[PDB]
Each structure stands twice: as C-alpha cells, then as structure tokens.
Amino acid sequence: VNSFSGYLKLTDNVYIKNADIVEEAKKVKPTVVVNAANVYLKHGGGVAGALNKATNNAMQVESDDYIATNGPLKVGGSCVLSGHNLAKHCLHVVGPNVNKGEDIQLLKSAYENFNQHEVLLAPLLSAGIFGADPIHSLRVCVDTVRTNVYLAVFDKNLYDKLVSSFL
Ligand SMILES: O=C(NCc1c(C(=O)O)[nH]c2ccccc12)c1ccc2[nH]cnc2c1
Incomplete structure (x- = not known):
C-alpha cells in the first residue's frame, strides 16, 4: 500500500491521473519524482521548468554542479539527484526531443531507467x-x-x- 490517490489503473504496474506533477509531488513526497530533463539539465520549461521553479531554483543549482563535474547526460540516459522539497530523489531522465530531431526509438531506452x-x-x-x-x-x-x-x-x-x- 502506498499514498497515491485517485489514479486509474491501466495495467498491473501503470497508473494514470490528471494532475499537476508539482502539486502531486508536494502532497505525496514520493520517493522518486521523474523530471523530463535535457542532456544539459537546463530546466527552462515544460515539466522541468515547473519542477525547478517549485524548488526555488535549487534543482538548477544542484544540476549545474552535476554537469560541471560529469558533463552532459546521454539522450536515453538519466541521473539521480535530490528531490528537494518535492520528493526524496529526482530521477532526471532524457527522452528524445523530436523538435531537435532525436531518434524516437531512444524513448524505450529512456523508460528503461524507471526499472x-x-x-x-x-x-x-x-x-x-x-x-x-x-x-x-x-x-x-x-x-x-x-x-x-x-x-x-x-x-x-x-x-x-x-x-x-x-x-
Ligand atoms: O509541460 C508540462 N507538461 C507536459 C508534458 C508531459 C505530459 O503532461 O504528458 N510530458 C512532458 C515531457 C516533457 C516536457 C513536457 C511534458 C508541464 C507540467 C506541469 C506544469 N506545471 C506548470 N507548468 C507545467 C508544465
């Protein structure tokens, strides 16, 4: 038993809801929230910009230190960083960005990080x-x-x- 509420069950292991991930994150304090990251961990818009804003930019500060030490992620890759005020951990996962021409087949590799x-x-x-x-x-x-x-x-x-x- 866990604390997620109001989800529709799609499969044995996948659930879905109409919710703002920021507000769902602040209420559940899940162990892991996934960010929709880019390889530079520049959290400008979309889900990443919203999560980062909710952390008062602490996510971006932590991310910039991560990149300065480790360099960019791979498309399809991930890293685990702090969840700040939203979760224990944030799993930053890079899906392919079609508006950059990235290969959509990398979407499966991106989801494998969730396992x-x-x-x-x-x-x-x-x-x-x-x-x-x-x-x-x-x-x-x-x-x-x-x-x-x-x-x-x-x-x-x-x-x-x-x-x-x-x-
Ligand atoms: O862009 C936002 N959601 C769309 C989105 C989905 C989805 O919903 O399936 N998946 C994505 C993957 C990458 C980038 C964007 C998305 C978002 C979410 C919460 C916000 N709160 C304030 N602004 C917000 C914007």
Missing part, C-alpha cells in the same frame, strides 16, 4: 514540448516499465484521450 526504482511519480517522457505523441509514449511506457509508475498528466483533455484510446 531501477520500485515506485515513481512521472510525466510521460518526450511528451509536451519534447514533441512526441503522448499516446505513443504511454504505449512505450506500458511495454517497457515493469516497476510501479504513477503518471501525472497535466492536461485534462489529453488525459481523456489517453484513457479512451488505451489498448
């Missing part, structure tokens, strides 16, 4: 400003992640299309 964590609150990778089809992203998520994933979908209209079209 290193028993339970996660997460957005749909490569959705939103990353330019992928969220329905495709949901299918890859379901077919790749084996751990328990609670997907927060900000847009109510999108949440309805994802549910109604889910196979």
Whole structure:
C-alpha cells in the first residue's frame, strides 16, 4: 500500500491521473519524482521548468554542479539527484526531443531507467514540448516499465484521450 490517490489503473504496474506533477509531488513526497530533463539539465520549461521553479531554483543549482563535474547526460540516459522539497530523489531522465530531431526509438531506452526504482511519480517522457505523441509514449511506457509508475498528466483533455484510446 502506498499514498497515491485517485489514479486509474491501466495495467498491473501503470497508473494514470490528471494532475499537476508539482502539486502531486508536494502532497505525496514520493520517493522518486521523474523530471523530463535535457542532456544539459537546463530546466527552462515544460515539466522541468515547473519542477525547478517549485524548488526555488535549487534543482538548477544542484544540476549545474552535476554537469560541471560529469558533463552532459546521454539522450536515453538519466541521473539521480535530490528531490528537494518535492520528493526524496529526482530521477532526471532524457527522452528524445523530436523538435531537435532525436531518434524516437531512444524513448524505450529512456523508460528503461524507471526499472531501477520500485515506485515513481512521472510525466510521460518526450511528451509536451519534447514533441512526441503522448499516446505513443504511454504505449512505450506500458511495454517497457515493469516497476510501479504513477503518471501525472497535466492536461485534462489529453488525459481523456489517453484513457479512451488505451489498448
Ligand atoms: O509541460 C508540462 N507538461 C507536459 C508534458 C508531459 C505530459 O503532461 O504528458 N510530458 C512532458 C515531457 C516533457 C516536457 C513536457 C511534458 C508541464 C507540467 C506541469 C506544469 N506545471 C506548470 N507548468 C507545467 C508544465
């Protein structure tokens, strides 16, 4: 038993809700919140900009130190950093950005990072400003992640299309 509320159960291990991941993160304090990161951990917009703002820019400060030490992530890769006031940990995961021409097949590799964590609150990778089809992203998520994933979908209209079209 865990503290996530109001989710619709899609599969054995995947759950979905219409929620603001920032507000869901502040209420659950999950062990892991997933950020929709880029390779530079520059948290300017989308989910990353929203999570970072909610940390009063502490996520960005920590991220800049991480990059200065380690260099950029790989597309499809991840790193674990602090969750600040939102979670114990933040798993920064880089899905491919279609608006940069990145190979969509890397979306499966990105979701594989979730399997290193028993339970996660997460957005749909490569959705939103990353330019992928969220329905495709949901299918890859379901077919790749084996751990328990609670997907927060900000847009109510999108949440309805994802549910109604889910196979
Ligand atoms: O961009 C936001 N959500 C869209 C999105 C999804 C999704 O919802 O499936 N997946 C993504 C992956 C990368 C980038 C963006 C997305 C977002 C979320 C909460 C906010 N709170 C204030 N602004 C906000 C913006």
